[PDB]
Write a protein that binds this ligand. Structure first.
Ligand SMILES: [Mn+2]
Ligand SMILES: [Mn+2]
Ligand SMILES: [Mn+2]
Lengths: 317, 214, 317, 317, 214, 214
């Protein structure tokens, strides 16, 4: 169909976060066999392989921001690949990896659809600047490069000269905030970005939150929706093998309801699955649950309803 | 559990030019490991923190490269205070494997051990035991042998050796195999020879005595 | 009272499912001492023992459906026993075992109360036919024998000739659906059966779902209600020792709220507790949690409110 | 500020409950470093040390009530200390320990604020009398000494002659009831005390329950609020190392939402954290989760919102 | 952990009529176990899948019964290609216990081993060891004994035996106890006798030599 | 794991006045432990349940104190039926450590063992073994020694001893070291002496025989 027409982009990338091991994100998810789990239902599955990311040894850092240039080269390569696969009319499934990849993901998606919107599901806002950071890790700084309102507030980071800020403060909705920096919360209150922390989800319920989210983004104008997802926004009871484990996250049922409502919009146009670290699994059972969680999220993004799904023909024959 | 293999096992260099060291990883660490300065009897000290970039007061000469399997550690301007066991250690994978050990020695020349066997004391015969101590002293390198001879019987297992550190002064070494016996097995024999085979020695030097001689 | 007047029926039965071990369902639950845990409050506890189920060695299968005749003999024996204990005016507590027992449970209940309704709480619809199955396991096929709308669509299965389809498509409400076959979802959309998957529960909340459930079943006419329950509909964090573990189930609090609202109706007339497998416990702790979960569900079915319960006399004496 | 001005009172006390080990409640929480976790945000942290509780060897019991006099001496010492630190205008952070300490906590708070209200978050009502008890443990009997309606119904317990009943039946709201005695439920229905068991929370959602709670207590008159908290009201998945583990408790997200709404009132005037037993941890991981849970509850009581918090200055500098 | 006890330990049958086999369970499996065909040096093969019903290309003769404690496996029409170790194995209980092993032999008659002791080579005396090898060959059944005699000293422990499979051709067996000694203990004695006791043998056959004879 | 140390290891008291006992904790139990009455060959019985308060039918004399580290157990009015191993045991900390053991004996006087060595039987020589049994009998206290002498050779390890309980009648004891030997080592010697050293003995009493005497 128009929905569940998939270009698969694997990015075995880790250089925007400290703990190496999310390079085996697409490796484990492909050996979890997301492709075959799509191929039952009417999915136009087409992988495009993994991207060859060069290793620049002289990736000289910024003041606090470390590894700018290899990350910028990675996201520029990924922006080309995402724009390429969205020329195909597919839905850009990109998965890594960490949030630094989402820069080029949203970039190449905005090259095709400049009118997009972002649902950034994450424990964090990841809205840090090079100035307002504490770690300098670019997986904590993807969003600030992509916001038009932080133009001039973004320093000239080596490797991100190609980056064009493509969305506005109204173009993005956060869901799942429970680990927010004072700089992050100050910027969030500064730009007036619509968000949904764990407080409002516990207040309204996940149905009312998803209702208000789709009313905010698609109630004005039906536009392509780029769900960019972090696994730590779900509770680490389900996803302990994530890079930034923060307790008190969303439930597995809640995330499945989110992705089912996104599929029932049908305006999903790009999916980003990051922070998948099998090396942070204390048991392989932890890895197994986390990977199955991410796969089931992706399947419910591409039509796997919990109520059941069938090919529209008679079965009583 | 990425195995870190340091390609120089040990090293000996009379103080001088580039004394570059090497460590290899079992996987791709990708510039995410560090270099260390475990001095003898001391706490280790950070040399390089991420494959380069010369951590926080390192003087002038301790660069390194890598990215991302086999890493280097350049000791370019040797400075003989820097004689210490060095360590690569991966970090960005759990669990966090160290390297093997990079004991940096001094390469003076190969010298001969001044070999001195010592009878056990009669005070040790008052203790009901006997430990025969065969010196090696003031030599280079540590590559030596001790073959105990008990009325010329090639014995071991009753013998514990003891390796000095390399001296700051004359860069030498000193060994002592300690042929700890019972008093009963001591009284069974007299000719207590100590066949010492070292590179500085031209011959396997057998230093001997008789039980009751000295 | 009229409520909490209990006939206890244990069925150490496994032949409708593959994994043997749910025969020790009534064994463990009785040695969990559900009787004594009823005997504090005003419960007319009366066990009727376990049923002697014959072992027919020549239980020749159907095409895909395996063991038809011993299962049919089991449910026919159980239909006689359920009709017997509902002649006593009691509430038919039946517990096994697997969903094949619920055939005879609803059968003997409909012999006494033909106007009943079924709340089938389960991860599955279990609405499979002999034709539309993938396993042929009759615990995946109990409901199809009991539906009047599938008359003719049910093949002549050896051992189920006594089975009369007793309820309509409007007579049953599913709660907890998260593992539905395409054949099952097609039949569910075909007959227009009222249901509540995990999507609508995450939307409305368990209170609104139970409100709409009792409005659908008892808002028209006050009729005897036969809650038939599966433990896998609750989340396997609470019940890992079930036969069909499917993640993302209902919470323990939600199931207790369901059973408390059912007790506050007072029209509960028959309870079925199936898929209790102590052999699938990886630890005995898993078995302990699962058994305590099922017992607490049964106690809240028979009056144990979380808010507290007391004999209606003065205690300040 | 006026809020988050803290007097810290540690009470290494256990003699109102059987299982010794909650004496290392303030020990572990202070070595968990709640102080430093307050000192980022604008907290006037001032510890007052631990209280020296005397060991009366001749603590002769009542009929069922055991250790009356050392517990009464403990709560009298604590009532003096709480009244002392509420003369300082601070917010009385008291933490132990068990519910017997909450007697003197509410006592010394009512010495300063006789118009207070109590939010007793607990799995239990703990409203038992010396007559209506089953254990006689005073951590099951704190509330009955503090209720004006049980005057005369309270026997003359040795060591509690100083105790003045200070609140009414309308002055207190229970949240989290799932283990209620028949005597407790009878007294609860007798006095008509407003409460919220797990049934009504599963019905209304935690947002509606907190809304109705603040409407009941502060909708009439803005008054100082003394949140007295038990960790067992949260689910033992998060807090297994509690003295009375009862399954089916509140979620960690729900408790954080409760404490965030309490901070957004700003009328929080005294906090009690009891039943912290590190010795009941089967693993140190259990202890770690439980302690981090209690600390995060306290931080969200003192301003740590999940949405994020910042000092009200510019960060884009 | 339901113990599966196979009531025939082994079986020997010259090819013919019903050769029915048996396995018992420690509990009630109730027709939920399978039958297997582990051939020697081969992967096992499914014979019966659920207590009957003759799985997927099994030829004509391999029925079985049970339901539900003691199960049968009927080898009715023997077909001597089917000589393999057979296995009951429960499945519908964890963990999934196998049976014991049902080595099906051939029952020709009881024959005598042609016993041949062999001195160690002088090449083994060049190795500083000695292994005396006492044959058994072309006999039936495997029920044999070897009693080594070292200047007529009943020894064991220095001897490893070796059991051939039953031949397809003549259904026989062959053994070799290998009295592996030191060369020193070899030189201590000459009369190296091998008392072989077998059913086909009328006597305990003592095959001997002298050190240096052959 | 709070270590419970009972300050009387054992006790002996001819029946009389206060026989108070003691147990110390490694931490502050604070009146949360109990006292027990493990009689010999019997189930233990509760004496005091929480540091005092005289549990449920205890007669008249078994008070105790504590609160909260070092606890007491007062046996005030001894009543010699109460001779049993006593136990403090903490409860309100996991895991729940017991005490050490408080064997209460009787303090009659120190008596001498009537020492009787016994040859092994010839029936034991028919068994191919030999066990020499040296009595001690009717003495006080248990503080004794046995030094076996095998043609006057101080041996042990081949000897297992055996301690009677203290008698109700005469409060005595009886020992038997059992010098279990081989028959071969038995035949090597005759003079089988048993040097018994006890406090009631003025001398180390050596009870002997010869192999074949009695
Ligand atoms: Mn994130
Ligand atoms: Mn089911
Ligand atoms: Mn409580």
């Amino acid at each position: 169909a128009k929905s569940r027409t998939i270009g698969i982009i694997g990015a075995p990338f880790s250089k925007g976060q400290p703990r190496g091991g999310v390079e085996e994100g697409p490796t484990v998810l492909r050996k979890a066999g997301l492709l075959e789990k799509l191929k039952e239902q009417e999915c136009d599955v087409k992988d495009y392989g993994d991207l060859p990311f060069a290793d620049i040894p002289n990736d000289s850092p910024f003041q606090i921001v470390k590894n700018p240039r290899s990350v910028g080269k990675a996201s520029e390569q990924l922006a080309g690949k995402v724009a390429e696969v969205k020329k195909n009319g597919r839905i850009s499934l990109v998965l890594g990896g960490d949030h630094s990849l989402a820069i080029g993901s949203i970039s190449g998606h905005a090259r095709v659809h400049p009118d997009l919107g972002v649902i950034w599901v994450d424990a964090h806002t990841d809205i840090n600047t090079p100035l307002t950071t504490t770690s300098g890790n670019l997986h904590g700084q993807p969003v600030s490069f992509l916001l038009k309102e932080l133009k001039g507030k973004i320093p000239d980071v080596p490797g991100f000269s190609w980056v064009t800020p493509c969305i506005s403060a109204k173009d993005i909705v956060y869901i799942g905030l429970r680990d927010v920096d004072p700089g992050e919360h100050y910027i969030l209150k500064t730009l007036g970005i619509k968000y949904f922390s764990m407080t409002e989800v516990d207040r309204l319920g996940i149905g009312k939150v998803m209702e208000e989210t789709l009313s905010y983004l698609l109630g004005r104008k039906k536009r392509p929706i780029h769900l960019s997802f972090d696994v730590d926004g779900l509770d680490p009871s389900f996803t302990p093998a994530t890079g930034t484990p923060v307790v008190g996250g969303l439930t597995y049922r809640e995330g499945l309801y989110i992705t089912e409502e996104i599929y029932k919009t049908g305006l999903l146009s790009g999916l980003d699955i990051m922070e998948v670290n099998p090396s942070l699994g204390k048991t392989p059972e932890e890895v197994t649950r986390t990977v199955n969680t991410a796969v089931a999220i992706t399947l419910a993004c591409f039509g796997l309803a919990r109520e059941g799904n069938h090919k529209p023909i008679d079965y009583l024959n | 559990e990425i195995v870190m293999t340091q390609s120089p096992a040990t090293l000996s260099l009379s103080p001088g030019e580039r004394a570059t060291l090497s460590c290899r990883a079992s996987q791709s660490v990708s510039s995410y490991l560090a270099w260390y300065q475990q001095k003898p009897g001391q706490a280790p000290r950070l040399l390089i923190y991420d494959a380069s970039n010369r951590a926080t007061g390192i003087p002038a000469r301790f660069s390194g490269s890598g990215s991302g399997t086999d890493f280097t550690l350049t000791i370019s301007s040797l400075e003989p205070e820097d004689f210490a066991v060095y360590y690569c250690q991966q970090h960005s994978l759990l669990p966090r494997t160290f390297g093997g050990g990079t004991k940096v020695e001094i390469k003076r020349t190969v010298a001969a051990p001044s070999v001195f066997i010592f009878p056990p004391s009669d005070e040790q015969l008052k203790s009901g035991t006997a430990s025969v101590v065969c010196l090696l002293n003031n030599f280079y390198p540590r590559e030596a042998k001790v073959q105990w001879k008990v009325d010329n019987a090639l014995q071991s297992g009753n013998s514990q050796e003891s390796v000095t550190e390399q001296d700051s002064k004359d860069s030498t070494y000193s060994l002592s195999s300690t042929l700890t016996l019972s008093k009963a097995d001591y009284e069974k024999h007299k000719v207590y020879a100590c066949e010492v085979t070292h590179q500085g020695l031209s011959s396997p030097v057998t230093k001997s005595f008789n039980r009751g001689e000295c």
